[PDB]
Amino acid sequence: THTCDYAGCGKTYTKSSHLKAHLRTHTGEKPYHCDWDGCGWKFARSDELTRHYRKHTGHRPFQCQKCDRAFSRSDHLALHMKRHF
DNA sequence: GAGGCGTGGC
DNA sequence: GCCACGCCTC
Ligand SMILES: [Zn+2]
Ligand SMILES: [Zn+2]
Ligand SMILES: [Zn+2]
């Protein structure tokens, strides 16, 4: 339904916002800026900025309930959990 | 773990 | 558009 019309691409998406995010791969647009003092990094996706900030802060919101390990991402925790079983 | 990215409820 | 699931590849 939503087609990339940049050059020879033609990739397709189910939401306008997915296509808009995809277009940044062609334009080099990076609207999400880190505001950490002195940093300067910018990203094409908001969740990429979120991941980046967790590098700055070392915040690990996803705590394993079966051992002491914690993670910055739910998918990391999920894979780790499989190791307990 | 980290980077890239498709995706759908809101 | 945000957020955050979660898959693929390294
Ligand atoms: Zn494209
Ligand atoms: Zn930064
Ligand atoms: Zn554990």
Author numbering: 399 to 483
Paste lines from the article.
A structure was previously determined for mouse Klf4 ZnF domain bound to the 10-bp oligonucleotide (5′-GAGGCGTGGC-3′), which is present in the basic transcriptional element of CYP1A1 gene. We modified this 10-bp DNA to contain a fully methylated CpG site and determined the complex structure of Klf4 at a resolution of 1.85 Å. Except for the side chain of Glu446 (see below), the overall structure of the Klf4 is essentially unchanged between complexes with methylated or unmodified DNA, with a root-mean-squared deviation of <0.5 Å when comparing 85 pairs of Cα atoms. The three ZnFs of Klf4 bind in the major groove of the DNA. As with the Zfp57–DNA complex, the two 5mCs of the two DNA strands exhibit different patterns of interaction with Klf4. A layer of ordered water molecules (marked ‘w’ in Figure 1f) envelops the methyl group of 5mC on the bottom strand. In contrast, the methyl group of 5mC in the top strand makes van der Waals contacts with the guanidine group of Arg443, which in turn forms bifurcated hydrogen bonds with the 3′ guanine G6, forming a 5mC-Arg-Gua triad. In addition, the 5mC methyl group interacts with the carboxylate group of Glu446, forming a weak (3.6 Å) C-H…O type of hydrogen bond —a common but underappreciated interaction in biomolecules and molecular recognition. In the structure of the Klf4 bound with unmodified DNA, the carboxylate group of Glu446 points away from C5 position of the cytosine, and forms a weak hydrogen bond with Arg449, which in turn interacts with the 5′ guanine G4. Superimposing the two structures reveals that Glu446 moves from the Arg449-interacting conformation to the 5mC-interacting conformation via a ∼100° rotation of the side chain torsion angle χ1.
Klf4 is one of 26 members of the specificity protein/Krüppel-like factor (Sp/Klf) family of ZnF transcription factors and is one of the four Yamanaka reprogramming factors. Using a protein microarray-based approach, 47 human transcription factors including human KLF4 could bind to methylated CpG sites. Both mouse Klf4 and human KLF4 proteins share an identical DNA-binding domain composed of three standard Krüppel-like ZnFs. Klf4 contains three tandem C2H2 fingers at its C-terminus. Here we analyze the interaction of transcription factor Krüppel-like factor 4 (Klf4) with its target methylated DNA element.
